[PDB]
Amino acid sequence: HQLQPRRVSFRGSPGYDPSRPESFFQQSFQRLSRLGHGSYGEVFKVRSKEDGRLYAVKRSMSPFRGPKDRARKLAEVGSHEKVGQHPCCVRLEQAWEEGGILYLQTELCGPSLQQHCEAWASLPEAQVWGYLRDTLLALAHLHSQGLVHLDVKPANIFLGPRGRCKLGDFGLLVELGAGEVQEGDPRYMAPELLQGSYGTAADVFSLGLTILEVACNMELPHGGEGWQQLRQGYLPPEFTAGLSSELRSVLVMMLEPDPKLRATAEALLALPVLRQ
Ligand SMILES: Cc1ccc(O)c(C)c1-c1cc(-c2ccncc2)cc(C(N)=O)c1N
């Protein structure tokens, strides 16, 4: 026998019949496509039987190994719930566990920025400015909730309608103690994180490298001298071919190595170039 699905929430089932053998996920959604699969599990595009609408569902790959493994996986939901509703953040609809598998159902978004870049070379800069602005709005929101994303990168930002984008993957959020967390991508890591230091500035730095990468369509270094030379407070000319003066200047504000001097998200959003 199998336990009924249980909702996962850190706050406080229609068309679904517990008498039937099939899972809540099998009963309650029509699977339309698989959007991704990895170590973590799989992400499907689905339509909900409850309301007829499209959603994305991520399910973990194998049953929990013990109580701490379970607790660590469930913590993604608690972090995501802390983000709540914001037009530039992937919205969680509900989460549940069944069969030792964790499910997160979110709004359905478009391709990640990584995927978008791979299937476009170099993006029109007008598009890039919109992605920068929307993800800065996301970070202003996170910081207001006392949260820092330690893995801002092209794979974790998803396109929406009319040039919009949404930040996701909130299992790598930490609170301002911090909470257990995994490794962020070294390509986009703020330099102060080498010393375990973090704060609201760190994801501004990662967003700077994220936007640099998608604007120049070149691979950023994961270590070595090239990694150091992106953390000195200038842009190596290797990366700036075809970047406008305006975009270059804003990225250099974001890439200041001293996090005490680095621009805040709100200061960046207040620049004339990022109006509206
Ligand atoms: C389901 C979910 C739960 C929590 C979360 O933080 C996020 C980002 C997701 C989410 C993940 C993906 C995805 C696509 C390929 N590879 C990895 C991930 C796509 C979407 C999407 N296109 O809607 C999506 N909402």
Side-chain angles (χ1 to χ4, degrees), residues 1-10 12-18 21-25 27-72 74-161 163-181 183-218 220-276:
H1 307 86
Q2 301 294 307
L3 292 178
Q4 293 182 15
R6 178 163 55 224
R7 175 174 187 178
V8 176
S9 181
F10 290 79
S13 57
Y16 165 70
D17 180 16
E22 314 311 335
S23 71
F24 176 77
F25 185 55
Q27 290 189 38
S28 304
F29 301 92
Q30 177 188 24
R31 233 185 267 182
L32 296 172
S33 68
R34 186 170 67 180
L35 303 180
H37 70 291
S39 48
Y40 65 92
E42 303 164 280
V43 180
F44 298 94
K45 173 179 169 187
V46 305
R47 184 177 303 278
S48 170
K49 182 178 178 171
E50 167 175 359
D51 60 25
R53 292 171 188 175
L54 301 176
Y55 293 95
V57 173
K58 178 171 61 83
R59 77 167 174 201
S60 60
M61 181 183 171
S62 71
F64 304 133
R65 299 183 313 270
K68 283 182 178 179
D69 181 40
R70 174 169 177 274
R72 288 198 314 270
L74 266 45
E76 179 180 9
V77 177
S79 292
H80 206 141
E81 284 180 323
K82 292 179 183 157
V83 181
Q85 304 173 42
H86 185 279
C88 302
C89 294
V90 175
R91 182 183 55 81
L92 181 67
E93 166 73 18
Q94 74 185 333
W96 65 95
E97 60 183 317
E98 190 177 5
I101 300 303
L102 177 62
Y103 297 79
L104 276 67
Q105 175 194 350
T106 66
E107 69 180 313
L108 182 65
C109 305
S112 75
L113 198 29
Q114 178 177 44
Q115 182 178 342
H116 185 67
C117 287
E118 286 174 351
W120 174 252
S122 277
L123 308 184
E125 240 183 59
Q127 252 175 301
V128 177
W129 282 108
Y131 304 146
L132 172 58
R133 187 172 187 278
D134 280 347
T135 310
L136 283 170
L137 292 164
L139 301 187
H141 173 62
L142 287 179
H143 299 169
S144 80
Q145 297 308 291
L147 308 160
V148 175
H149 203 303
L150 294 175
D151 205 16
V152 174
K153 61 192 182 184
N156 285 338
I157 292 166
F158 299 83
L159 274 71
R164 293 218 330 214
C165 63
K166 303 184 184 240
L167 179 66
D169 191 31
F170 293 121
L172 268 91
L173 236 41
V174 296
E175 266 197 319
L176 296 156
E180 293 178 58
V181 91
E183 252 293 344
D185 189 321
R187 295 173 289 175
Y188 310 98
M189 189 173 44
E192 63 272 19
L193 278 173
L194 293 166
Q195 132 180 302
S197 302
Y198 75 97
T200 51
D203 38 23
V204 171
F205 185 94
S206 297
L207 179 54
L209 289 185
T210 290
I211 295 295
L212 180 66
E213 184 169 67
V214 312
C216 73
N217 191 35
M218 298 168 65
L220 301 188
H222 47 275
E225 193 63 30
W227 186 95
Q228 296 287 355
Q229 293 304 324
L230 278 158
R231 291 165 170 85
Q232 302 293 309
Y234 71 89
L235 290 173
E238 157 170 18
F239 298 110
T240 60
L243 269 56
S244 63
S245 293
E246 292 75 14
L247 177 64
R248 285 185 219 184
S249 65
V250 171
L251 295 171
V252 164
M253 297 174 80
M254 299 178 71
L255 295 175
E256 160 61 43
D258 182 346
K260 296 187 192 173
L261 291 173
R262 186 179 306 142
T264 65
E266 294 93 346
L268 291 158
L269 288 165
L271 293 172
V273 66
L274 282 171
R275 282 280 194 86
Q276 297 219 16

mmCIF file of all heavy atoms in Angstrom, residues 35-36 40 43 56-58 76 80 90 104 106-110 158 168-170, ligand 1:
data_model
loop_
_atom_site.group_PDB
_atom_site.id
_atom_site.type_symbol
_atom_site.label_atom_id
_atom_site.label_comp_id
_atom_site.label_asym_id
_atom_site.label_seq_id
_atom_site.Cartn_x
_atom_site.Cartn_y
_atom_site.Cartn_z
ATOM 1 N N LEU A 35 10.042 19.168 -20.536
ATOM 2 C CA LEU A 35 10.846 20.381 -20.744
ATOM 3 C C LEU A 35 12.312 20.205 -20.358
ATOM 4 O O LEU A 35 13.187 20.905 -20.877
ATOM 5 C CB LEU A 35 10.289 21.542 -19.939
ATOM 6 C CG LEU A 35 8.827 21.852 -20.268
ATOM 7 C CD1 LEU A 35 8.394 23.049 -19.391
ATOM 8 C CD2 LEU A 35 8.638 22.156 -21.750
ATOM 9 N N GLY A 36 12.585 19.277 -19.465
ATOM 10 C CA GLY A 36 13.940 19.099 -18.974
ATOM 11 C C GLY A 36 14.101 17.835 -18.154
ATOM 12 O O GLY A 36 13.134 17.310 -17.624
ATOM 13 N N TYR A 40 18.394 16.044 -10.797
ATOM 14 C CA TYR A 40 17.280 16.469 -9.955
ATOM 15 C C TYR A 40 15.931 15.824 -10.234
ATOM 16 O O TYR A 40 15.007 15.935 -9.426
ATOM 17 C CB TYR A 40 17.078 17.968 -10.113
ATOM 18 C CG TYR A 40 16.658 18.310 -11.511
ATOM 19 C CD1 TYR A 40 15.308 18.383 -11.852
ATOM 20 C CD2 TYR A 40 17.607 18.522 -12.508
ATOM 21 C CE1 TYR A 40 14.912 18.689 -13.146
ATOM 22 C CE2 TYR A 40 17.218 18.836 -13.824
ATOM 23 C CZ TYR A 40 15.861 18.921 -14.124
ATOM 24 O OH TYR A 40 15.451 19.220 -15.405
ATOM 25 N N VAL A 43 11.142 17.895 -15.536
ATOM 26 C CA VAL A 43 10.146 18.965 -15.572
ATOM 27 C C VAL A 43 9.235 18.723 -16.740
ATOM 28 O O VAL A 43 9.720 18.515 -17.836
ATOM 29 C CB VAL A 43 10.786 20.331 -15.763
ATOM 30 C CG1 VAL A 43 9.707 21.397 -15.793
ATOM 31 C CG2 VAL A 43 11.807 20.559 -14.656
ATOM 32 N N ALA A 56 3.868 24.123 -15.253
ATOM 33 C CA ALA A 56 5.064 23.295 -15.299
ATOM 34 C C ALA A 56 5.101 22.503 -13.982
ATOM 35 O O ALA A 56 4.724 23.045 -12.936
ATOM 36 C CB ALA A 56 6.343 24.126 -15.472
ATOM 37 N N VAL A 57 5.484 21.231 -14.066
ATOM 38 C CA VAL A 57 5.670 20.432 -12.822
ATOM 39 C C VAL A 57 7.027 19.804 -12.807
ATOM 40 O O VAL A 57 7.418 19.096 -13.782
ATOM 41 C CB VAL A 57 4.617 19.328 -12.694
ATOM 42 C CG1 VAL A 57 4.909 18.385 -11.495
ATOM 43 C CG2 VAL A 57 3.203 19.943 -12.598
ATOM 44 N N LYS A 58 7.757 20.051 -11.722
ATOM 45 C CA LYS A 58 9.048 19.404 -11.513
ATOM 46 C C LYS A 58 8.855 18.293 -10.511
ATOM 47 O O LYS A 58 8.266 18.501 -9.479
ATOM 48 C CB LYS A 58 10.104 20.421 -11.015
ATOM 49 C CG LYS A 58 11.483 19.820 -10.726
ATOM 50 C CD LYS A 58 12.455 20.928 -10.465
ATOM 51 C CE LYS A 58 12.045 21.780 -9.251
ATOM 52 N NZ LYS A 58 12.511 21.131 -8.000
ATOM 53 N N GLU A 76 13.209 23.414 -0.505
ATOM 54 C CA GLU A 76 13.015 24.229 -1.727
ATOM 55 C C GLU A 76 11.634 24.879 -1.707
ATOM 56 O O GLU A 76 11.438 26.067 -2.082
ATOM 57 C CB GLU A 76 13.175 23.387 -3.015
ATOM 58 C CG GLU A 76 12.955 24.204 -4.253
ATOM 59 C CD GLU A 76 13.102 23.409 -5.539
ATOM 60 O OE1 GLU A 76 13.204 22.144 -5.449
ATOM 61 O OE2 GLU A 76 13.070 24.061 -6.638
ATOM 62 N N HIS A 80 10.759 28.790 -1.910
ATOM 63 C CA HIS A 80 9.919 29.299 -2.997
ATOM 64 C C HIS A 80 8.671 30.034 -2.453
ATOM 65 O O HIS A 80 8.252 31.071 -2.981
ATOM 66 C CB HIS A 80 9.504 28.126 -3.895
ATOM 67 C CG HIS A 80 9.193 28.537 -5.291
ATOM 68 N ND1 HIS A 80 9.560 27.783 -6.385
ATOM 69 C CD2 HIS A 80 8.564 29.643 -5.785
ATOM 70 C CE1 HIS A 80 9.160 28.390 -7.490
ATOM 71 N NE2 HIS A 80 8.544 29.516 -7.149
ATOM 72 N N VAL A 90 9.244 33.210 -10.887
ATOM 73 C CA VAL A 90 8.384 32.039 -11.183
ATOM 74 C C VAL A 90 7.474 31.748 -9.997
ATOM 75 O O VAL A 90 7.967 31.574 -8.877
ATOM 76 C CB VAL A 90 9.294 30.803 -11.488
ATOM 77 C CG1 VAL A 90 8.417 29.521 -11.688
ATOM 78 C CG2 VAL A 90 10.081 31.073 -12.736
ATOM 79 N N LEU A 104 6.800 19.976 -7.579
ATOM 80 C CA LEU A 104 6.468 21.413 -7.497
ATOM 81 C C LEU A 104 5.756 21.811 -8.753
ATOM 82 O O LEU A 104 6.311 21.630 -9.851
ATOM 83 C CB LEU A 104 7.732 22.323 -7.357
ATOM 84 C CG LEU A 104 8.303 22.506 -5.930
ATOM 85 C CD1 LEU A 104 8.858 21.225 -5.415
ATOM 86 C CD2 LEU A 104 9.454 23.541 -5.999
ATOM 87 N N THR A 106 4.422 24.874 -10.886
ATOM 88 C CA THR A 106 4.484 26.333 -11.016
ATOM 89 C C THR A 106 3.741 26.817 -12.225
ATOM 90 O O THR A 106 3.365 26.035 -13.061
ATOM 91 C CB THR A 106 5.944 26.805 -11.193
ATOM 92 O OG1 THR A 106 6.480 26.322 -12.456
ATOM 93 C CG2 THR A 106 6.757 26.304 -10.042
ATOM 94 N N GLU A 107 3.562 28.125 -12.334
ATOM 95 C CA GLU A 107 3.155 28.693 -13.612
ATOM 96 C C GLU A 107 4.092 28.162 -14.720
ATOM 97 O O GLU A 107 5.266 27.865 -14.479
ATOM 98 C CB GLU A 107 3.232 30.226 -13.568
ATOM 99 C CG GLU A 107 4.638 30.789 -13.482
ATOM 100 C CD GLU A 107 4.623 32.302 -13.448
ATOM 101 O OE1 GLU A 107 3.900 32.895 -14.289
ATOM 102 O OE2 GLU A 107 5.250 32.901 -12.541
ATOM 103 N N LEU A 108 3.523 28.060 -15.923
ATOM 104 C CA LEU A 108 4.323 27.689 -17.088
ATOM 105 C C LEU A 108 4.989 28.907 -17.685
ATOM 106 O O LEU A 108 4.279 29.891 -18.056
ATOM 107 C CB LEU A 108 3.440 27.080 -18.173
ATOM 108 C CG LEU A 108 4.222 26.613 -19.430
ATOM 109 C CD1 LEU A 108 5.172 25.482 -19.113
ATOM 110 C CD2 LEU A 108 3.252 26.184 -20.548
ATOM 111 N N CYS A 109 6.301 28.850 -17.776
ATOM 112 C CA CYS A 109 7.075 29.900 -18.451
ATOM 113 C C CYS A 109 7.615 29.424 -19.800
ATOM 114 O O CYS A 109 7.486 28.262 -20.167
ATOM 115 C CB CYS A 109 8.248 30.349 -17.601
ATOM 116 S SG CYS A 109 7.658 30.870 -15.924
ATOM 117 N N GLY A 110 8.221 30.365 -20.525
ATOM 118 C CA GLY A 110 8.883 30.048 -21.791
ATOM 119 C C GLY A 110 10.258 29.451 -21.548
ATOM 120 O O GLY A 110 10.618 29.036 -20.446
ATOM 121 N N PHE A 158 13.616 32.669 -17.124
ATOM 122 C CA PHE A 158 12.728 32.081 -18.115
ATOM 123 C C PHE A 158 11.960 33.174 -18.814
ATOM 124 O O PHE A 158 11.462 34.113 -18.191
ATOM 125 C CB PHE A 158 11.705 31.071 -17.458
ATOM 126 C CG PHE A 158 12.430 29.932 -16.791
ATOM 127 C CD1 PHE A 158 12.940 30.082 -15.481
ATOM 128 C CD2 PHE A 158 12.737 28.802 -17.522
ATOM 129 C CE1 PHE A 158 13.723 29.063 -14.896
ATOM 130 C CE2 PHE A 158 13.476 27.758 -16.940
ATOM 131 C CZ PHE A 158 13.966 27.907 -15.620
ATOM 132 N N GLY A 168 13.829 31.958 -11.532
ATOM 133 C CA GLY A 168 13.338 30.765 -10.818
ATOM 134 C C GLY A 168 14.438 29.996 -10.111
ATOM 135 O O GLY A 168 15.490 30.572 -9.827
ATOM 136 N N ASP A 169 14.187 28.723 -9.815
ATOM 137 C CA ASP A 169 15.127 27.839 -9.117
ATOM 138 C C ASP A 169 15.483 28.373 -7.740
ATOM 139 O O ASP A 169 16.657 28.756 -7.463
ATOM 140 C CB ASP A 169 16.435 27.670 -9.946
ATOM 141 C CG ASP A 169 17.348 26.548 -9.413
ATOM 142 O OD1 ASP A 169 16.841 25.557 -8.868
ATOM 143 O OD2 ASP A 169 18.607 26.677 -9.542
ATOM 144 N N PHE A 170 14.516 28.397 -6.853
ATOM 145 C CA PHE A 170 14.717 29.031 -5.563
ATOM 146 C C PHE A 170 15.236 28.112 -4.472
ATOM 147 O O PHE A 170 15.294 28.532 -3.307
ATOM 148 C CB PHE A 170 13.411 29.657 -5.141
ATOM 149 C CG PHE A 170 13.009 30.801 -6.016
ATOM 150 C CD1 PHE A 170 11.794 30.786 -6.717
ATOM 151 C CD2 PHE A 170 13.887 31.861 -6.251
ATOM 152 C CE1 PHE A 170 11.462 31.861 -7.533
ATOM 153 C CE2 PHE A 170 13.577 32.953 -7.086
ATOM 154 C CZ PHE A 170 12.308 32.951 -7.739
HETATM 155 C C1 LIG B 1 8.739 23.329 -12.619
HETATM 156 C C2 LIG B 1 9.607 24.353 -11.783
HETATM 157 C C3 LIG B 1 9.564 24.350 -10.427
HETATM 158 C C4 LIG B 1 10.299 25.233 -9.704
HETATM 159 C C5 LIG B 1 11.124 26.191 -10.397
HETATM 160 O O1 LIG B 1 11.864 27.088 -9.585
HETATM 161 C C6 LIG B 1 11.197 26.197 -11.690
HETATM 162 C C7 LIG B 1 12.047 27.249 -12.438
HETATM 163 C C8 LIG B 1 10.425 25.300 -12.449
HETATM 164 C C9 LIG B 1 10.596 25.281 -13.985
HETATM 165 C C10 LIG B 1 11.738 24.607 -14.470
HETATM 166 C C11 LIG B 1 11.924 24.544 -15.952
HETATM 167 C C12 LIG B 1 13.096 23.818 -16.485
HETATM 168 C C13 LIG B 1 13.267 23.524 -17.920
HETATM 169 C C14 LIG B 1 14.403 22.829 -18.317
HETATM 170 N N1 LIG B 1 15.304 22.484 -17.395
HETATM 171 C C15 LIG B 1 15.198 22.769 -16.037
HETATM 172 C C16 LIG B 1 14.103 23.475 -15.569
HETATM 173 C C17 LIG B 1 10.993 25.132 -16.749
HETATM 174 C C18 LIG B 1 9.891 25.844 -16.229
HETATM 175 C C19 LIG B 1 8.905 26.483 -17.170
HETATM 176 N N2 LIG B 1 9.288 26.641 -18.494
HETATM 177 O O2 LIG B 1 7.819 26.828 -16.830
HETATM 178 C C20 LIG B 1 9.637 25.898 -14.796
HETATM 179 N N3 LIG B 1 8.577 26.598 -14.312
#
